[PDB]
Design a protein around this nucleic acid. Structure first.
Ligand SMILES: *C(=O)[C@@H](N)CCCC[NH3+]
Ligand SMILES: [Mg+2]
Ligand SMILES: [Mg+2]
Ligand SMILES: [Mg+2]
Ligand SMILES: [Mg+2]
Ligand SMILES: [Mg+2]
Ligand SMILES: [Mg+2]
Ligand SMILES: [Mg+2]
Ligand SMILES: [Mg+2]
Ligand SMILES: [Mg+2]
Ligand SMILES: [Mg+2]
Ligand SMILES: [Mg+2]
Ligand SMILES: [Mg+2]
Ligand SMILES: [Mg+2]
Ligand SMILES: [Mg+2]
Ligand SMILES: [Mg+2]
Ligand SMILES: [Mg+2]
Ligand SMILES: [Mg+2]
Ligand SMILES: [Mg+2]
Ligand SMILES: [Mg+2]
Ligand SMILES: [Mg+2]
Ligand SMILES: [Mg+2]
Ligand SMILES: [Zn+2]
Lengths: 86, 60, 155, 123
RNA sequence: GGUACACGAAAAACCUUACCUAGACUUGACAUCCUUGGCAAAAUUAUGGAAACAUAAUGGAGGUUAACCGAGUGACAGGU
RNA sequence: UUGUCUAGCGAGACUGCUAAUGCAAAUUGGAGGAAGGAAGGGAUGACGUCAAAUCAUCAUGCCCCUUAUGUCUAGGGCUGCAAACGUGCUACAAUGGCCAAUACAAACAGUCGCCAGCUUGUAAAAGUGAGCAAAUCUGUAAAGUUGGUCUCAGUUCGGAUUGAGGGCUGCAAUUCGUCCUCAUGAAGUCGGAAUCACUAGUAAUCGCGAAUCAGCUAUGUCGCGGUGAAUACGUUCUCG
RNA sequence: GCAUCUUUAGCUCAGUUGGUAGAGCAAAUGACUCUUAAUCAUUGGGUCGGGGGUUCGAGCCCCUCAAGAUGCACCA
């Protein structure tokens, strides 16, 4: 879908923290509000706290989850059972 | 919450796609005529007074 | 509650066999508002009729349509329970019109192939008083004959 | 017929016969047809061995029809083994894209299982 | 109900938006009236930032305050 | 292809003439006439009813909040889903599917736009790039005609759903944009009780344009033209 | 007398045969309407009659009490 010339997309605020956080050995969960950032190869090995709307759900990225958007691996709404009307 | 939105619309946003068109007489956001900058229910009042030159009732 | 009788539009003499009635059946088989398509379909069936019956297509069409034309018409009239029917003599204009409508209706349901051959077979099958349109005419005639008693009371 | 485990109708033209294969549709069938130079409108029954080997070779060069089923299957497992919300939406037998689920989208939910609408005694 | 249900809405990704979760503000984002000066607001580049917003920069059209930029200031502004 | 066409003014149709019968309005027929008896359509909608709808277009009495029910921003939501109904689109097909050639519109719109031609690309589109502030330039008309093929099959019908690869807009397309290409090929073979619209360029149907709009499964809305029917015997029943 | 059963939110009753409780009304809260009724949602509310004992654990199994009701004798 997304054009070629444009490429991928990160907010570059997430990119800067990831570069800083990968150099630092004692990595901790990275609190990012950017559900819009696509997972870049360098992201591999870090863990993020994506804002589902209410809380920050923790996602551990792998060498496989690479390519999709960072908010795609977290939910936003919840539905598990209806209730008999009558 | 009307007055604050009107003022914000006049102010320039930080993104081009963030700019929308709101009626200039009232503050109605939807159903705004870009040809006149006037919403559908202010255009009726203005058209029925003769303020807009040439807008006459239609018989087709 | 109307007190006015509707006007009537011209029927037009046919453009080939000069038999008005051809234009009427063309309009009857009309679907999707295609005048062109309908003429082609119908005209092709007369050519198939030539290849098969070795006779004049207009004569065969009249012999089929004239034979299908009914005589009595049963009008529904409910009073308390069900409807007691009433046989009435249908006008000449409606006689041809009803005949054409039945011809088309049983033609678009035959087990045959392209509607050209479908419609061609129905008319040739109706020139010998043995078909699907004939049975419909037979049924209404017998129903009217059975309900001969209430013919005197109409409304 | 003779092309792999597929049995293309014998009384049907070759360009439609290729569509009958799972991995070959209609447009891609024409691509094989033009590339092999074999003229269409040639009933497969009235065809010779010389064409039956070339068509098989190009079909083998393309993606095997039997491997595509496992390819889609690995992909769904690939999508579900990641834990994606889209995978979850595909997981519970629901529209995977953005299709609405309020009053429509029954082609993925099978037959209707009618429940009991609320009781309105008036208010 | 007829006279609601491709209706308000002649365009909900952000904006719209009036809702929820959060991060920030208090004569306030906008206005007048009053004591009082104008030698700005913008925009943009930095750093921290989810962005609000802060700390630094070119200090800005102009016209001497016209409009606005403010201070002080309580009546109040504001409410989809 | 010389008098179309476009838009200013005017003429024209007035029961004006005649026949019938009525006191008189007036009804019917005929004449001539492009048009005959509200020539077709539109705007134009009495007092009032339903305490009908809108405090969320706007304005406003009264009540309520006033470091919060006011304000700014980021993310989510208005797009959910065991279900039911309403309005539409697409179909279940040879009055058709696909391919090739090809004829004939009206209206409207356009300088952050319409975009011709050319080059690349299986295509959406990209690059180059004139022309047009517009009766000048641009926005491919489709059904329709002819030819080839399918030969009645859940199919060369039907397109849903799903996977992958691309293009455009936009900071940004996962929640939640649409387009193209490839892959798959749900249901559905005329739809129960019961219901809706329509009296001629009307119903049915085929395209085209505009509004809001950066973009939008608007199949919606407002307009324009192409083809173009059937029926009305009558008020016994039915609704108002 | 005896043998048998019952005592469970404000009321009428299921609990299950051992991991510590709900159903229907009543009440309240909203929603809903000019406002009510009704309806609809939601909802707080328990010394499982009082003690003892078994069990890791008793509304649940066994005893004694307190209050009633049953079936068997107001000697065949
Ligand atoms: C009659 O019923 C007698 N057999 C019973 C006498 C009982 C005396 N305790
Ligand atoms: Mg307001
Ligand atoms: Mg959607
Ligand atoms: Mg109503
Ligand atoms: Mg929003
Ligand atoms: Mg100065
Ligand atoms: Mg001064
Ligand atoms: Mg108010
Ligand atoms: Mg009038
Ligand atoms: Mg009312
Ligand atoms: Mg938002
Ligand atoms: Mg909606
Ligand atoms: Mg429609
Ligand atoms: Mg054909
Ligand atoms: Mg010219
Ligand atoms: Mg089937
Ligand atoms: Mg199809
Ligand atoms: Mg998407
Ligand atoms: Mg069939
Ligand atoms: Mg009418
Ligand atoms: Mg249709
Ligand atoms: Mg109320
Ligand atoms: Zn307005």
């Amino acid at each position: 879908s997304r054009s070629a010339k444009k490429g991928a997309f990160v907010d570059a605020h997430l990119l800067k923290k990831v570069i800083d956080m990968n150099k630092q050995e004692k990595k901790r969960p990275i609190k990012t509000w950017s559900r819009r950032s696509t997972i870049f190869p360098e992201f591999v090995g870090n863990t993020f706290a994506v804002h589902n709307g209410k809380t920050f759900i923790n996602v551990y990225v792998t060498d496989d989850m690479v390519g999709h958007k960072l908010g795609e691996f977290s939910p936003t709404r919840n539905f598990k059972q209806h209730t008999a009307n009558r | 919450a009307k007055k604050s939105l009107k003022v914000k619309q006049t102010r320039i946003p930080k993104f081009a796609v963030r700019a929308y068109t709101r009626c200039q007489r009232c503050g109605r956001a939807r159903a705004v005529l870009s040809h006149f900058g006037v919403c559908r229910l202010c255009f009726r009042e203005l058209a029925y007074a003769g303020a807009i030159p040439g807008v006459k009732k239609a018989s087709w | 509650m109307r007190k006015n009788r509707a006007p009537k539009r011209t029927v037009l003499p046919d453009p080939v066999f000069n038999n008005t009635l051809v234009t009427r059946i063309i309009n009857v088989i009309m679907e999707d508002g295609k005048k062109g398509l309908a003429q082609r379909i119908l005209y092709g069936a007369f050519d198939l009729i030539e290849q098969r019956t070795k006779e004049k297509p207009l004569t065969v069409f009249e012999r089929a349509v004239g034979n299908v034309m009914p005589r009595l018409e049963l009008r529904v009239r409910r009073i308390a329970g069900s409807n007691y029917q009433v046989p009435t003599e249908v006008p000449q204009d409606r006689k041809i019109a009803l005949a054409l409508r039945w011809i088309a209706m049983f033609a678009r349901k035959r087990h045959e192939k392209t509607m050209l051959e479908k419609i061609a077979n129905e008319i040739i099958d109706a020139s010998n008083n043995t078909g699907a349109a004939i049975k419909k005419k037979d049924d209404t005639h017998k129903m009217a004959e059975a309900n001969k008693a209430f013919a005197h009371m109409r409304w | 017929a003779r092309i792999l485990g597929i049995d293309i109708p014998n009384q049907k033209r070759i360009e439609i016969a290729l569509t009958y294969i799972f991995g070959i549709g209609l447009s891609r069938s024409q691509a094989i047809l033009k590339q092999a130079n074999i003229n269409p409108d040639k009933r497969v029954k009235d065809l010779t061995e010389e064409e039956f080997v070339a068509i098989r070779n190009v079909a083998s060069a393309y993606k095997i029809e039997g491997d595509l089923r496992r390819e889609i299957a690995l992909n769904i497992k690939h999508l579900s083994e990641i834990g994606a919300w889209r995978g979850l939406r595909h997981r519970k037998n629901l529209p995977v894209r953005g299709q609405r689920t309020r009053t429509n989208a029954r082609t993925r939910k099978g037959p209707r299982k009618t429940v009991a609408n609320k009781k309105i005694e008036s208010k």
